[PDB]
Amino acid sequence: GKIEEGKLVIWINGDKGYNGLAEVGKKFEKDTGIKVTVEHPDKLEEKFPQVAATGDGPDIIFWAHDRFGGYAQSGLLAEITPDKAFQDKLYPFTWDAVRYNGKLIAYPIAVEALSLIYNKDLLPNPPKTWEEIPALDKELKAKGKSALMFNLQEPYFTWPLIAADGGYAFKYEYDIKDVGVDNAGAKAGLTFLVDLIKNKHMNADTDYSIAEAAFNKGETAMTINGPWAWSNIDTSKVNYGVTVLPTFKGQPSKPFVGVLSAGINAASPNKELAKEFLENYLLTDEGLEAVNKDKPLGAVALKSYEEELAKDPRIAATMENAQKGEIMPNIPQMSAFWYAVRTAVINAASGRQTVDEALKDAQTGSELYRQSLEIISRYLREQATGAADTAPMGASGATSRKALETLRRVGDGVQRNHETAFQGMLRKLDIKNEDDVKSLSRVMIHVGVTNWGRIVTLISFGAFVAKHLKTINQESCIEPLAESITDVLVRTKRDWLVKQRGWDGFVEFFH
Ligand SMILES: OC[C@H]1O[C@H](O[C@H]2[C@H](O)[C@@H](O)[C@@H](O)O[C@@H]2CO)[C@H](O)[C@@H](O)[C@@H]1O
Ligand SMILES: [Mg+2]
């Protein structure tokens, strides 16, 4: 393929200890004579699937575990198979974070959680609540200081506040259909954030570099950040502490907890070299120390070394916050969830959208895959078998139910009129089984200006193909067909779909 044999290319994010990781690479190189190269590309979490989708990219990819389910779903990750003895060296719950559809898809490295980081010289007793921060900022401003600065350009940092009074991503009691991005709890949290901005206690333009600089220069009493940030604070000589996030409406802030993880490119011809590196060089006391001494990892997955790091009050703080939060899902639409909420926070903070409308859009964006799949899967199946699914629609049931009713009505005419066209198209494609389904969805996408009619024709071809698959005793292929059409639709037409308020707009358009 495109990835070079006999060497290792490793990608890790720019806020992590990539110089320390390179030291581990240098030791691997010394032992074996095999080159290891560490890179930290911009927009890593977007660059990796771009290049890997064509069989290119790094042998080894590092990111929090939340992104890896999507990567695995898209066929970009190799299944990893550590022996029992190696598995038992790491905490079982860290392997859980990197299991997808029953398979391990990455090596867990470390548990990351956000904490409140405060300047002990300015603020010897950090606030226990978010609510007292406006008053604290007024006191500090009289001294030429501010109370709090953190990255507002990434939803990770604001999420703890959103989740505090009841906001959630996908319900965990998982029911993926149940999404809590625009409930009252999420709205209260984001509204508090926006009020801080409108009362000049924070600035909507604040990003990672700006907040880090302000804290490390001693201009702001507090920031919110993970363990990787501590190294630069050490260098700056600020007298800092790491503690529990403030409560909001008497409830703990609930950070989304990430497990830094290393995956192996499905297209790498160096999977055994990667395995050797990750298991016998990185995931050891010495390997993890080399990275940790560069930028702190947090609470590492390796039991032996975590027993040492656990005595650190900053790690104790980290795990305190982690226990109040929640391990991230790794479902394939986590990416779409984060994009949706990123846009909602930035738009609300800038005043481009009200909090209510911003979160409504993030709700629709986060629900889009599962809602679309429910409708499309049911349509394809009932079209293939001739009989409807009588199972309850579930959450947002009126929308799914009314969209399916609309799709049946409009779809009947589209299929009748396009029958000749569809027959010709199918014949040219030679679709025999599930391996043909992947390529099919892509071609279906292309075959300009977005409108619902074009989307009905797309789905109707899907139904036509579903009937064919049923007829040739490949009824098992219908659900991956449905999943593939859905993925194509919601990814390529995301912004338009959200602008229509999703399937509610479809129902309204054809009323
Ligand atoms: O902001 C959305 C973003 O959040 C998380 O990314 C974290 C990452 O986990 C940390 O290791 C650190 O690098 O900060 C990032 C946020 O800037 C999710 O892991 C990521 O997928 C998501 O897009
Ligand atoms: Mg809207």
C-beta of residue 238 within 8 angstroms of C-beta of residue 215: yes
Tell whether ligand 1 has an atom less than 6 A from the beta carbon of residue 112: yes
Under 8 Å CB-to-CB from 92, ≥6 apart: which residues?
Answer: none
C-beta of residue 347 within 8 angstroms of C-beta of residue 178: no
Residue type, 507: V
The closest of 67, 73, 6, 75 to 36, measured between CA atoms, is 6
What are the structure tokens assigned to 478, written together? Answer: 């219908």
Distance between CA atoms of residues 277 and 52, nearest Å: 20
Resolution of the determined structure in angstroms stands at 1.9
> For the purposes of burial, counting CB atoms within 10 Å of the CB of 479, is it exposed (0-12), middle (13-18) or buried (19 or more)?
middle
Distance between CA atoms of residues 341 and 329, nearest Å: 15
What are the structure tokens assigned to 379, written together? Answer: 């349509």
Residue type, 6: G
C-beta of residue 8 within 8 angstroms of C-beta of residue 28: yes
Nearest ligand (C-alpha, residue 365): 2
Distance (Å) from CA 161 to ligand 2 centroid: 22
Q: Point out the ligand 1 atom lying closest to the alpha carbon of residue 339.
A: 23
**Residue 87 CB neighbours (<10 A):** 12
C-beta of residue 499 within 8 angstroms of C-beta of residue 460: no
Distance between CA atoms of residues 168 and 337, nearest Å: 11
Residue with CA at minimum distance from ligand 1 atom 16: 156
Distance between CA atoms of residues 240 and 76, nearest Å: 41
Distance between CA atoms of residues 116 and 231, nearest Å: 16
Distance (Å) from CA 117 to ligand 2 centroid: 35
Q: Could you give the 3-state DSSP secondary structure of residue 459?
A: helix
Distance between CA atoms of residues 405 and 379, nearest Å: 10
Among the residues of 208-333, which ranges form H helices?
208-216, 230-236, 271-277, 285-294, 303-309, 313-324
Distance between CA atoms of residues 352 and 346, nearest Å: 8
> Would you give the distance in Å from CA 24 to the centre of its chain?
28
What are the structure tokens assigned to 331, written together? Answer: 């479902």
Distance (Å) from CA 12 to ligand 1 centroid: 12
What are the structure tokens assigned to 433, written together? Answer: 């089984």
